[PDB]
Nucleic acid binder design. Sequence first.
RNA 1: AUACGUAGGGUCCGAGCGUUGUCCGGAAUUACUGGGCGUAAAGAGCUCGUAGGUGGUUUGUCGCGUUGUUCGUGAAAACUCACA
RNA 2: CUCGAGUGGCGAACGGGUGAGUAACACGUGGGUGAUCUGCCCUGCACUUUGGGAUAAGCCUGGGAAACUGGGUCUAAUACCGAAUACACCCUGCUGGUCGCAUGGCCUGGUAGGGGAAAGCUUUUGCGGUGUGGGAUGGGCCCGCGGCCUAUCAGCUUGUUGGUGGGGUGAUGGCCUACCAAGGCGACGACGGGUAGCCGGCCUGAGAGGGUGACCGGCCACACUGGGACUGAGAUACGGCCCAGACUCCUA
Lengths: 92, 84, 113, 200, 122
Amino acid sequence: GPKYTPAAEKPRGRRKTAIGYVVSDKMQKTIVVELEDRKSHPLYGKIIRTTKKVKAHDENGEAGIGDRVSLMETRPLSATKRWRLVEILEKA
Amino acid sequence: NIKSQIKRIRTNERRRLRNQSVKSSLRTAIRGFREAVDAGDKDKASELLHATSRKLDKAASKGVIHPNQAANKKSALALALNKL
Amino acid sequence: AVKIKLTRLGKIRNPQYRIIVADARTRRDGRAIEVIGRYHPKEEPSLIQIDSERAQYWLGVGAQPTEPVLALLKITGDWQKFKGLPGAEGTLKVKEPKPSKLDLFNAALAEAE
Amino acid sequence: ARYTGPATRKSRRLGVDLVGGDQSFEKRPYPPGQHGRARIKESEYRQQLQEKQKARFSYGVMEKQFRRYYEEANRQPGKTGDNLLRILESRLDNVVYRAGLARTRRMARQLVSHGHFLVNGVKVDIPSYRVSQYDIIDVKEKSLNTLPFQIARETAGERPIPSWLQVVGERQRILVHQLPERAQIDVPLTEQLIVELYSK
Amino acid sequence: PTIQQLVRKGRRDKIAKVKTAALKGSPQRRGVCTRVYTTTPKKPNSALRKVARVKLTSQVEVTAYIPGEGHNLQEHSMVLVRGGRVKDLPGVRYKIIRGSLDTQGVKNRKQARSRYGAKKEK
RNA sequence: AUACGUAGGGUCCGAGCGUUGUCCGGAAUUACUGGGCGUAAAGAGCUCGUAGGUGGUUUGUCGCGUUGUUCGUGAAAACUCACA
RNA sequence: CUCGAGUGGCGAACGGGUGAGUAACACGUGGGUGAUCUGCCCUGCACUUUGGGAUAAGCCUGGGAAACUGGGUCUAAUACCGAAUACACCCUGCUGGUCGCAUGGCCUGGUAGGGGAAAGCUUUUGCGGUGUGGGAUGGGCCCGCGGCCUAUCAGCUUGUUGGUGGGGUGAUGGCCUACCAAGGCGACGACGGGUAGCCGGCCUGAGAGGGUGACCGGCCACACUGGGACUGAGAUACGGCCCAGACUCCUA
C-alpha cells in the first residue's frame, strides 16, 4: 500500500466566548473584563446576579474602559490571563 | 528491603551514568556554539550548528534525550546562526 | 495494550461472566469500556451471548482476547469472521428447547381431564 | 422459624375460633388465666393487636414473616389491605390446606416440614414457599399410603376447595388457576386496621 | 420574611441539646469506681439509692447508679458504666451493668431476669 | 402495691429477647415547601444614606434571565419495573 | 537434554493497603489543549549495511569485624561503541495554494540547505530487528458549573500582575530568568483559624429536607519522618536509591 497514510481533522473550536465590559484596561497588552450572570437560587428562588473579573490579553490595546466587547478563551497565555478580545462592538 | 531486582538497580545505575557524560558533552558543544554565535562569526556558527544538528539528532535517535527537545535545540541554534 | 477479558459476577457457588474489553493494567472488575458478551459456565450450555460487530471492530483495531476468552470466541465462531479462515458459522451450542409457561398447564389440564 | 404453643389459649385470649372447631375455646370463651373474666381496659390499640394476633395465630404464620407480608403488600400497586389478604392467602401450606387435604394448619406445617408435597416437580421443605398460578402440585406416595394421610385424603369432607384451587384427580393434583380474589377468599376479620397502624 | 435577607443569611437550627458525655457516644465504657456513698433522692420519693462516681477509661469523671438490691462492686473495681436517666436523683445519668466486668448480677432477680445480671436459674 | 419484691396467671416475641450508643422523622423544634415579633421569644432611642435589594405608564429592539425543541449526555451495579 | 550462578532482555509505576494529609479543578457533571505524550496490541511502506571497544560470568590475587570490598586475566551476544544508506522524518531559508480561533491550521506542500537506524536466535507452529505513516487505548494541560464552618479572621499582595526577550519543559504558561511597567485580589468575602478526601450511593423523611462516605464501585492523596535524585513509554517509585533526624537491632 501507500507509504503515507493520512489523518483526521478532529473538528475543533467553540472556545468559550462571551460578551463582557472592559473595565481595567490599564496594563500593557492587558485588559480586565466583567461578565453578568442571572441564576435562580438553589433553595429560595431569588435569582441572583453576579459578576467575574477575567483578565484578557489585548496585543493591540484596542479596548478601553467601559467597552462592550466579546472574548474567546485561549490557551493559558500567562498566570491569570486567558482571554482573547475579538468581535469588538461597543466603545465607552 | 531487597527483592530479586538488584539487577535493575545496577542496570539503572549504568543507564543513568552513561547519560551523564553524554549530556555533559552535548551541553559543552551547545555552549561552544553559543560563544560562536555571540562572537558574531557566521561561518563558525554555521558549522557548529551543522555539527550539533548531527549530534543531538544522533542522541535523540539514541536513548539520551526525547525527540522533541533535540528539535527545539536544533531550531534555536539554527535561528541563532540565521541571525548571529 | 488492549485485551478482551472475562469478568466474574453472581453469587458464590454459581459463576457468571461478562465478556468485556479493557486494559491489562486494570483489575478483573474495573471500568469496562464496553460489555461485548456474557457467558456462564454454571448454566447447562455455558451459554454465551456476544455483541458481534463491536467485537469485530475491536479485533480489527487490535483487541487481544484472553486465552479462555479466545476459546469462547472460537466457541462462537467469531474468530472465524475477523480472521475469517473458514468463514463465520454458529459454533456455540444452545439451551435445550424446554416447554413454555402456558403449555405446561395446558398439558396438565389435558392429563387431568 | 416456628412457634411452640397450641391454639386454644390464643383462641380464648383473642376471643375467636383459631382451631375452627375448638370445643374448649367455646367452653372458655374468655381469655385464659385468672383474669380472662376480668374486664380489659378497652383500646383500639387492643382491637388492632387482637386482629393481627388472630391473623398470625390462625395460619401458623409467625411475626417476623408477617411484617414483611404487610411491607410487600404495601409495595404492591393495589391497596395494602387487599394485597396483604391476597398474599396471606397465597402460601404453600395455605394452598394445600384450602384444597381440604390437611385437617389443620399444623397438618400442612408439619407436612412441608417432612417433605410430603411437590410443586411443579420440585420438592420444597419450606412452608414459606410461594405457589404461583397454574402450578402443578402432587403428593408423594410415602405419605400417600400413610394411614392418617389416607384418612385426610379419602375423608376430605373438610372446607371446600376455592375456585382458584382445583384438585383434579386421585393424585391430589391441585391445579391452581388464579389468585385468591377478594370476592372469593371469604376471609376472616379484615386487615385495614393493620394497614393504618403500620403506616404510622 | 425578606427572601433576599434569607439569601443574605439565616436558617440554622437551635441547639444540639446533647445527652451523653462519657465519650464517643459509647454504648458502654469501663473504669474505676469510687465514692460509692449513698445519697438522698427527691423528697416525695423518700428512700435512699446506692450510687458511685466512676472515672471511666474515657478520661471523664461521671456519676453512675447501682441498680438492684445487692451490689458486688467496691473501691478499685473494673466497672462497666452505661448511659442512664435517673430523674429521681440530681445529676445522675449513668448505671453499671450487672453480670458483667466487675459487678455481679443482682441476687435472685426474677421479675426482670435479663437486667440486673440475673443469669438463668438452673 | 395489679406500679415495689414474690408466685401463679396473662400479653407478646422467639433462637432469639431485651439494654446501652447514634441518626432521620414525629418537631411546623429554622416555618422555601412550612413561623412569628402590641400583652407569650422578638421594631435597635431616632434620623439619612453607601452596598444591596427593589420598582410607575407607554413605543420598538435584544432573547441574557425564562420557557419550547433536537441531539450528545448522565459507568455497571444504584433504585425500581418486568423476566428468569 | 537440563539448568544454578552470570550477562542481557522484559515484568515489576500495574495488581493489593490506608484515609493521615488535603477546603484544593480534589471529585463529579460538560467542554476545549490551534499548547500534547503513548512500551505493550492492530495496520501501510521502506530499511536491516558495516566496522570496532569493553565486561559480568569464569578464574587467580588482596583488604575489611561484619557490612562488604580491591587488583590481574578472560567472556558472548537481540550487549555496547565507529561509521554507512533513510528521506518515508525532523530543523532552517524562501515560497505557492488553502481553512481560519488571533497566535495560526491543512497540502507526508514545494523548494533548497542540514541532519537522523537496525539483530540475532532458531528449525521452528518460527521467532525475531529499524524508521515513518496511521489505528487503538492509555493518557498529560486549561476552562463552565455543583457541592464546610468561622470577622470573637477585612485587608492581602512584589516573581504578584502584564509585556518583552530568553532558560526550561511534551507542549502553554513568573514555570524559571534579565529588563520594563504597577498592577492583581476582595464585603458577590480575600487574606487567616478550625475543620474534612471526594462521588456513584446509602439511610430517614410523604415530600422537601436532613445524616453517612460502611461494604460494593470511581478517582485522589499517602507507604518511620523530613530533604534530593534516578530510570524507564511511564516513579509520593508501599516489598527502587541517596541525604538529615528519630527509633530499633547488630557491632572486632
